């Protein structure tokens, strides 16, 4: 546990999907060893805004890391804000009386730990502001943000954005996992799948089956052969368009090419991006038309 150098790279890999389910996929073929349904945890992003159909705007966050914020309005397509969800929460409470209208940003961030049996996928015990219960198992953390923005005109937001993560002990290991110890090297790919390529010359080796939702979180698992622990570390990632889509609860989310180069390149150009017969107003009056319009890849400027 001091130098990632010593430690077996396990054949297990751990994936999180955008609907907030957790699966263990086998690093050698992309076989789905087991999944856990997201009733067991929390939705990864759930944005609750004042209304897409009256105003032609929607709030959108990239469900990754700090949870970066983006925004789309039918008048000027998709924009990236210089704000992060963690970062906003970390600067509450903020009251701003623009001069004109005033907002109030009140935050909330929780921490939780689960220990899960690898072999199987059963949650052995769950800790923290969550539900405190009591071999070859693994312990995984998950931070959960929740920004509430309270505008007095009434234009009332309420995003909640959760995100998995290693035990903050092991995080110095993560700076050592600079490229897969393995030759392999796996990423989210098209149609809710993982694709694994070789490192040398970027060539597809395996494709996984489908996951209930797009895979947005990825973990290598190492073995301390002395202490016999299952320490887990994020899978590294290889060296300005973003791809939009929505979760099942209908919240919009982004995947930047910075973070999801591999997916965003295999992704179709969004209709809105392509033809103005899709940027006309009638379109954003209807939910289904809207969805169809902006889903896919745009290119922020």
């Amino acid at each position: 546990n001091r130098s990632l150098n010593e430690l077996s790279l396990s054949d297990i890999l751990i994936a999180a999907d955008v609907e907030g389910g957790l699966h263990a996929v086998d690093r050698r073929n992309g076989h789905i060893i087991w999944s856990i349904e997201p009733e067991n945890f929390q939705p990864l992003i759930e944005i609750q805004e004042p209304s897409r159909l009256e105003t032609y705007e929607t709030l959108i966050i990239e469900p990754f890391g700090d949870g970066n914020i983006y925004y789309f309005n039918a008048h000027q397509g998709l924009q990236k804000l210089p704000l992060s969800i963690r970062q906003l929460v970390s600067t509450s409470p903020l009251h701003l009386k623009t001069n004109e209208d005033e907002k109030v940003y009140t935050g909330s961030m929780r921490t939780i730990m689960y220990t899960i049996n690898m072999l199987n996928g059963e949650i052995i015990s769950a800790f923290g502001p969550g539900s405190k219960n009591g071999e070859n198992m693994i312990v995984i953390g998950k931070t959960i943000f929740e920004l509430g923005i309270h505008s007095y005109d009434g234009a009332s937001y309420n995003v909640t954005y959760s995100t998995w993560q290693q035990n903050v002990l092991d995080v110095p290991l993560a700076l050592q996992n600079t490229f897969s110890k393995d030759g392999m090297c796996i990423a989210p790919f098209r149609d809710k799948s993982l694709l694994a390529s070789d490192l040398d010359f970027r060539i597809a080796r395996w494709v996984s089956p489908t996951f209930p939702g797009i895979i947005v979180g990825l973990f290598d698992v190492f073995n301390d052969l002395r202490t016999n622990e299952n320490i887990l570390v994020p899978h590294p990632f290889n060296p300005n368009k973003v791809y939009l889509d929505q979760t099942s609860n209908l919240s919009w989310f982004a995947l930047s090419s910075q973070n999801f180069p591999s997916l965003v390149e295999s992704a179709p150009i969004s209709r809105y991006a392509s033809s103005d017969r899709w940027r006309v107003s009638s379109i954003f009056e209807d939910e289904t038309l809207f969805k169809n319009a902006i889903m896919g890849v745009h290119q922020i400027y």
Binding site: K181, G183, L199, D200, R202
Partner: peptide
């Protein structure tokens, strides 16, 4: 393992 890695 001589694993080589994408150029700089």
């Amino acid at each position: 393992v001589v694993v080589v890695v994408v150029v700089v």
